[PDB]
Amino acid sequence: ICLGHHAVSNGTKVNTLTERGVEVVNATETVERTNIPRICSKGKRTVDLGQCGLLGTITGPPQCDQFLEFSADLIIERREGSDVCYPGKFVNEEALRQILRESGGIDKEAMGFTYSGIRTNGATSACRRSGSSFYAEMKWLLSNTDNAAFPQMTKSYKNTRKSPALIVWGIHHSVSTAEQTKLYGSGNKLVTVGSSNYQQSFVPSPGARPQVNGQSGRIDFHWLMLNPNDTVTFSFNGAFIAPDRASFLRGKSMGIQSGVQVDANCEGDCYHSGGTIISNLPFQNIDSRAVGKCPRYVKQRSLLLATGMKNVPE
Amino acid sequence: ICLGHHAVSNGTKVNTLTERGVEVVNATETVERTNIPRICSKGKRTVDLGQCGLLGTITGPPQCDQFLEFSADLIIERREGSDVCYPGKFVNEEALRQILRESGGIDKEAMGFTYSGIRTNGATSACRRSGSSFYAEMKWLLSNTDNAAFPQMTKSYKNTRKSPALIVWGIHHSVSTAEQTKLYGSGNKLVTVGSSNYQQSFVPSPGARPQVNGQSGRIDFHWLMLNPNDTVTFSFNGAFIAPDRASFLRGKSMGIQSGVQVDANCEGDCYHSGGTIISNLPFQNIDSRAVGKCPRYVKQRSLLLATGMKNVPE
Amino acid sequence: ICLGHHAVSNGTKVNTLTERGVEVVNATETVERTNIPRICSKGKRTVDLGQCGLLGTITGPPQCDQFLEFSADLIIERREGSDVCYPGKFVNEEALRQILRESGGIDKEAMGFTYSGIRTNGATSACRRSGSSFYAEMKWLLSNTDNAAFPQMTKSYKNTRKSPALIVWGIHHSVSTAEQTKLYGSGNKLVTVGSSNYQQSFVPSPGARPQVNGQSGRIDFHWLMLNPNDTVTFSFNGAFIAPDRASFLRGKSMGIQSGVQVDANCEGDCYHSGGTIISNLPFQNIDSRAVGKCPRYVKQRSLLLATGMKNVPE
Amino acid sequence: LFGAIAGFIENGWEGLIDGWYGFRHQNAQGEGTAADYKSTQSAIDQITGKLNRLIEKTNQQFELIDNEFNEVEKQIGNVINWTRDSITEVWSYNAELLVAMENQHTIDLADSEMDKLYERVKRQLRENAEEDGTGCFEIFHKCDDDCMASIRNNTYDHSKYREEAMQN
Amino acid sequence: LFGAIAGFIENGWEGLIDGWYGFRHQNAQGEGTAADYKSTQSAIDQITGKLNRLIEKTNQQFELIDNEFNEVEKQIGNVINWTRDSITEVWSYNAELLVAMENQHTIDLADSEMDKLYERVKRQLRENAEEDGTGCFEIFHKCDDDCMASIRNNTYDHSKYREEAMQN
Amino acid sequence: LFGAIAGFIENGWEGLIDGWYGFRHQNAQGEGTAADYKSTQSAIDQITGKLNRLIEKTNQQFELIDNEFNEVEKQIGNVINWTRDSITEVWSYNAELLVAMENQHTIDLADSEMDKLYERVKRQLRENAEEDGTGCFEIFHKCDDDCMASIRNNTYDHSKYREEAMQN
Ligand SMILES: CC(=O)N[C@H]1[C@H]([C@H](O)[C@H](O)CO)O[C@@](OC[C@H]2O[C@@H](O)[C@H](O)[C@@H](O)[C@H]2O)(C(=O)O)C[C@@H]1O
Ligand SMILES: CC(=O)N[C@H]1[C@H]([C@H](O)[C@H](O)CO)O[C@@](OC[C@H]2O[C@@H](O)[C@H](O)[C@@H](O)[C@H]2O)(C(=O)O)C[C@@H]1O
Ligand SMILES: CC(=O)N[C@H]1[C@H]([C@H](O)[C@H](O)CO)O[C@@](OC[C@H]2O[C@@H](O)[C@H](O)[C@@H](O)[C@H]2O)(C(=O)O)C[C@@H]1O
Ligand SMILES: *[C@@H]1O[C@H](CO)[C@@H](O)[C@H](O)[C@H]1NC(C)=O
Ligand SMILES: *[C@@H]1O[C@H](CO)[C@@H](O)[C@H](O)[C@H]1NC(C)=O
Ligand SMILES: *[C@@H]1O[C@H](CO)[C@@H](O)[C@H](O)[C@H]1NC(C)=O
Ligand SMILES: *[C@@H]1O[C@H](CO)[C@@H](O)[C@H](O)[C@H]1NC(C)=O
Ligand SMILES: *[C@@H]1O[C@H](CO)[C@@H](O)[C@H](O)[C@H]1NC(C)=O
Ligand SMILES: *[C@@H]1O[C@H](CO)[C@@H](O)[C@H](O)[C@H]1NC(C)=O
């Protein structure tokens, strides 16, 4: 009696410790190359920001009017999104995004600030609603008249909540020293900001910048996280965009950036810009910056795992 | 004649390349789970800072009076510690801590600065000793009288040592412009600082902050490391906390943060907040941020290593 | 008939999973220890900067006159190199170096700025050419007379190229307020800088610094990358070192720092400060900071790989 | 490696599609190529066990540390990339090594299960047969489709057949 | 794998507490279950060698890069955590693979030391005995507690016992 | 491990310099120590294959992230070093494990190729010889330098020599 083993005509080459391209009976892939070009969001509370920039959800330009209090498990940032109506930018902007990405969304709360002896309704054609408007969560504070002066004020807000209060204000930089006075009166203007945690201070810096959204002035946005029972204090005298509302984190989420569309028909946990990686494989060669729960990125396109004996034909 | 192998009634399940839970005769753990809830410091020159904050050892608030020149192999920071009597904070504070943590302690040296035509003994009830005092290593420089003016001075200190000289100064921010003048006289006050290495400059920023330690003003602490034979120069005119002494690193140490007590009866080399990991195992699941000489942190609670053959009973 | 295996007198001890120092017939090293103490640059467009500092190639101190438009695959920085004639330094200097290191070199282009009603030829004995000169790519802008005043100007430059335009300017800090006025007239001087991307602003800070290159003033160098079709705008009024030319990246290169000499007789791809690592081995114990295409750094001096059976003598 | 598959056995049977290891005898009553189950199955449950070890679930979430719509500052940007690339080299290495090591073992494993089949058929037909040297056994007592079944399913009497073959 | 432990040998001896591999004969003078030392010891010195390779001493110190009393700035904080978690995945993987690989080898190693014991007792009793097929050897010349010792300690004459058994 | 090299075979031949595995017979016509090629070569092509797997080419460039002429800011500096040291531990571990694992396998591999040589010389000289127990075969029909060559190059008739030896 004789005994042997099975074999096949066309087998699969694999690599070993000792060889490269040794044929075995069967193999299976170990590295994921298959992408689905959609944001698989089945079963997840999802928010696609579209034209609203993530930081805009805090300040409130018109793009973000429907996002001032969003709630999500999954936040999607889009290339067309803007944090801004009136031209400007945030200091430590990316840290803030990462915070907002894992926030579960935001709840807003009035800080209560009341004003006496200044203007309060400063607006612009860069922020269109009815006509000229401003950031919905912010207050463009002004001298009473088309010159006048600005009484060095002090506003204070106490976080009476069990969570950190995201506070945001702005420093306005006018086209000129002429403009800065026509808005806030004359003299070196100063904004100081402090909490039992925090310690900073600001002077505007007027001058002509190039035109963005038809505007040559800029607004500098700054922020801090107020701990519970801690108080923040705003000592200012002009060039100042007052926070009207504060923001609180809802819970937990994941944020991604993508150019592909949402699909509530597929479930995914590993995301990147070009879609969703749905796989059981330990590795992937699709995108090294994929986020969520992903196989490990490798450089190799393919690594075949033997699922059979050596293939020996006659 | 027949031959077999030994076996046991109750064996130990382990995992293999091919299986999960295959029983072997004996096994041994590979992942450390056992903690000792004390700072094992046997044989080590140890300093427990208690209420003195690590950065306070440089500036000298009353909590740190017994730590102005400490010498250690192991430095322990405590949650109750404060770098500060008069409210304020350091710029690039964490970099400094990491420096102080591996310093082996500090030696102090007079910088020699002499003053003429100003006050020098500025104090506060936030820094209690006899009565009102100040940071022991610093000089609260003031205008001669309860208004007066401040002559724009220049002080220079040359590191005549073979090691870098840690220099630290402060910028004082008063409650108001009223207070800033009642202390240092009127006008935009400026402090400039430069070495053959370094290049910076400061203006105060008065305004009302919330009360910390019964005080609404703040002190901004800054620092630089002066290389040997390099000179540093302080051009100022007010709002300035002068360095009275400089600091030099003694050698080498390790710094930790902990809430558990010191034990000179056990020797450890791997520390974390909840104690000491004493182990020979290659891995641990106790604390991913453990410092010193530690097994590698892994997520698994347990990984059993076979120390015997497969267990086969009848 | 009998059969055995070969053996040798003196064999090579190796380590296994189970043993340490088991002798085998032959072995081979796996960790590279052999260095070549020269910069193997065979076949590569190489630039040794010598005394020119990498950042100097942008601003143009006399050391860098022959490097204002270099083109390279490999850039070598030297310890004796300086970015500076007139004492000063760059903000975010290291980021810039890393940019310049992988740039393939630079092309220069006039920004076109024309001036009327101020001086333009500001120089110093710190920048020697014929006699007193200045940075070749920069313009020391001044008030017309040995006092006079400075008309708050505005200059704008549009990147009309398909690549980002490296823009660089300087802020001059004089020895005093006396000097600042004798140069630029009186008053708080301000430079503002903005692009459809960027947003910043500067005030000088005069005061006596120690003498570097016989000079107690400093120049603060700042920079930004202007995207194509984006415009940058300089609103200023004094204390300002104007960019005369902009810089564009040529392509791709690698930058290293070394104290050893160039050798066009050897080809290398793995570099460090003490030379070139030429090896096929997967690992090296020479320098953990080696750059280019290198074996992986390991702590072990040696790890011997069995290339034969166990050696058993009689 | 054990020396069976691609060993003294010259090749495989591309007609054996009932299992991995089987039997084929050459007696009077025509032929018969068969299949062994408990050798086929045991090698299958082990390859299946390897494969099911490489499919797992990181409940380990990673977040964005970078921004592709708005580049982060260069210095931190470069540190991040440098870090990511270092980590990428590590995993690319781990993957390549894992698979090579696993395949080497899978192959030596299937070879093992041939040799363990053989060497116990050999011990079944005690002295009533001889090793040809190509995985074949010369039976010196003309076995049939009742005998041949008794070998295939391990029931062959390793004595009640003996001396008929012993003196031959 | 070699096919002895959990191989053709059906099970183990939970009364063999003198070593890992031993002997048990079934002759006239009652019984005797014994222990082999040089097979027991060699497998022990190898498991002991693996274990002593996993216990080592990083003279590699790591310092605090973080602060739990006073959180560092968010951006650098997130980079640090991201880095730490990546490194954690690496080590968790290394650990799991190391142990699985090591256990697989330890098991195949002990099986090996059974087969190496056997197959050389088999070569000691040249043609004076036969392989039963359960790890047992039928001696065809009634050996005793003097013979049985001579096998256990490798002194059995592989000829001066022969023909007494040969014709049986 | 298979139990040949440092197994029952007591030692090696420091005069066998023609290959890894060879033959040495002890008949009337003096002597002869030889070399087997296809066992020597197969073990060589496998060690050669391991070695050629550890020599490769990262087209993976890394750039400076640090500065040794001009130290970067302390905070980012410390993060970078902390990161580099973590990565260094990983590679030092990978290297040490790789080599230990590879050597273990190389050694068990050469042992394998001894046992595969032997066990098929054994199957060549069917019942015309016996296993001494030190890797030696007692031929019971006085073979010579024509026979001995026929074994060395696998041509020995495993029958046309038989009964001359069978009754001895
Ligand atoms: C509160 C206020 O003053 N709002 C103004 C606004 C601000 O003065 C300005 O944004 C601050 O820099 O200016 C508004 O129109 C500005 C106008 O300026 C012209 O020179 C330019 O040609 C126009 O495109 C436009 O930017 C504005 O809408 O912002 C009017 C508003 O009332
Ligand atoms: C050098 C000096 O002026 N020291 C003062 C100190 C400083 O003026 C002040 O810290 C600078 O901001 O003020 C001291 O008392 C301040 C006092 O202010 C009251 O309004 C408040 O109600 C009190 O709690 C207290 O803070 C001080 O102790 O710091 C007096 C000291 O002489
Ligand atoms: C444009 C201009 O003013 N150039 C001056 C230069 C500048 O005024 C100065 O660098 C700005 O701080 O000064 C120059 O000589 C300065 C001179 O100062 C003496 O006090 C000192 O003893 C000398 O060593 C020297 O530094 C210069 O060369 O920079 C003259 C130049 O015309
Ligand atoms: C090939 O391998 C994969 C993984 O085991 C499997 O899906 C498939 O069934 C295999 N082919 C055969 C012949 O079974
Ligand atoms: C927080 O708020 C509670 C409720 O008013 C108050 O009693 C308490 O003082 C606060 N906690 C702290 C930090 O003191
Ligand atoms: C179980 O394993 C460990 C590690 O070798 C050892 O301490 C212990 O002695 C073992 N038990 C027995 C039966 O020896
Ligand atoms: C350092 O000090 C010595 C001793 O006075 C001095 O001679 C020397 O000039 C200094 N070194 C340098 C950097 O010039
Ligand atoms: C020793 O090992 C190396 C690597 O294979 C090789 O260069 C050399 O030839 C070997 N020595 C012998 C005896 O061949
Ligand atoms: C870039 O330049 C082209 C050529 O003049 C111009 O037409 C176009 O408007 C610019 N692109 C952008 C960003 O608008």
Ligand SMILES: *[C@@H]1O[C@H](CO)[C@@H](O)[C@H](O)[C@H]1NC(C)=O
């Ligand atoms: C980091 O790497 C990405 C590609 O992964 C590249 O596009 C980007 O330019 C790099 N970031 C920086 C700051 O250079």
Ligand SMILES: *[C@@H]1O[C@H](CO)[C@@H](O)[C@H](O)[C@H]1NC(C)=O
């Ligand atoms: C980093 O991780 C720790 C837990 O390891 C977490 O507590 C902390 O919030 C994280 N840091 C930041 C800046 O989010």
Ligand SMILES: *[C@@H]1O[C@H](CO)[C@@H](O)[C@H](O)[C@H]1NC(C)=O
């Ligand atoms: C980083 O490590 C290097 C050695 O590799 C050391 O010289 C340097 O001081 C370290 N950097 C910092 C910022 O401490």
